[PDB]
Amino acid sequence: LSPMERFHLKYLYVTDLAEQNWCELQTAYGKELPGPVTTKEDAWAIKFLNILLLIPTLQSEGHIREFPVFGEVEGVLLVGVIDELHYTAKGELELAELKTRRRPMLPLEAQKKKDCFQVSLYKYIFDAMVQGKVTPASLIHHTKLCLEKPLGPSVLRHAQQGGFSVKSLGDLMELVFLSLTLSDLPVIDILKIEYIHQETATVLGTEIVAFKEKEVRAKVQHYMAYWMGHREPQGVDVEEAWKCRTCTYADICEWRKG
Ligand code: SF4
Ligand SMILES: [Mg+2]
Known part of the structure; x- marks a missing residue:
């Protein structure tokens, strides 16, 4: 019985893989020992209507926040929310992820590696979305969305x-796929992480993630291999044994x- 089946999971969050980068075993324990008026058809419909509104906003106002992402990645559906998307002064699409710390210390290199993997996943999923690699069939196969169930009055x-007239949920998804791929949305050019002190608003450092597609895919294939039940989960390396002091x-x- 695979962990996705054991933990009654049908998709994963981008942060589940980020925490998996910190410790895969600690993430596994987190899913095993954790510590309805709307419907899943309605919730995903709201997510689709948000996308249909954010795409022209980014292409006209040049700046959006809270852009949801989703897509099948190595047989597992990965879902996420981008903090911020905006075109730079040079016309480059830049992704911003803001990290606030209550203590004004520099972030740990292990925390930076985890945060770099999170935003690399955002570009990995976003690029696949705007390039036509995420179909409505892949989401329905993974989320069990019933298309003939009419959308509840909360969604209409x-x-x-906003002026738009929805038909059924299926027609809502086909318009999202069209607007994602045919509205001149480019791939994310810049991945930018910013560390800020909560109180004094001091910049604690700024990382510019050097995105390499092959390395990102290889790490994902390794992480999704555990969730699908093809290998045992791993703990942290011996040089990072300090992570267990607070685990x-x-x-x-x-x-x-051991
Ligand atoms: S004790 Fe260490 S190796 Fe074990 S789950 Fe916690 S962080 Fe991972
Ligand atoms: Mg964020």
Whole structure:
């Protein structure tokens, strides 16, 4: 029985893989020992209507926030939300992820590696979306969305308020696929992480992620291999054994003992 089946998971979040970069075993324990008026058809419809509104905003106002992303990645559906997207002064599409720290210390290199992998996943999924690699069939196969169930009045409220007339959920998805791929949306050019002190608003550092598609794909194939149940989960390396000093599951983790 695969972890996705054991933990009753049908898709994953981008942060689930980011926390998996910190420790795969700690992430596994987090899903095993954790510590309805709307419908999944309605929730995804709201996500689609947000996209249909954000695409022209980014292409006209040049700046958007909270852009949802999704797509099948190595047999697993990965879902995420981009903090910020905007065109630079040179016409480059830049992604911004803001990290606030309560203490004014520089971020750990292990924290930077985890954050670099999170935004690399954002570009990985976003680029696949605007280039026509994410179909409505792949989402329906993974989310079990029933297309003939009519959308609840909460969504038609959220919709016609913006002027658009929705048909069924299937027609809503086909317009999203059209608007993602045929509206001249480019690939994300710049991946930018910014670390800020919460109080004094001091810049604690700024990373510009050097995106390499082959390395990103290889790391994803390795991580998704565990979730599909093809290999045992791994703990942290010995040089990063300090991660278990504060790990919730350090008292029953037999990797830290072995
Ligand atoms: S104790 Fe260390 S190796 Fe074990 S789950 Fe926690 S962080 Fe991972
Ligand atoms: Mg964010």
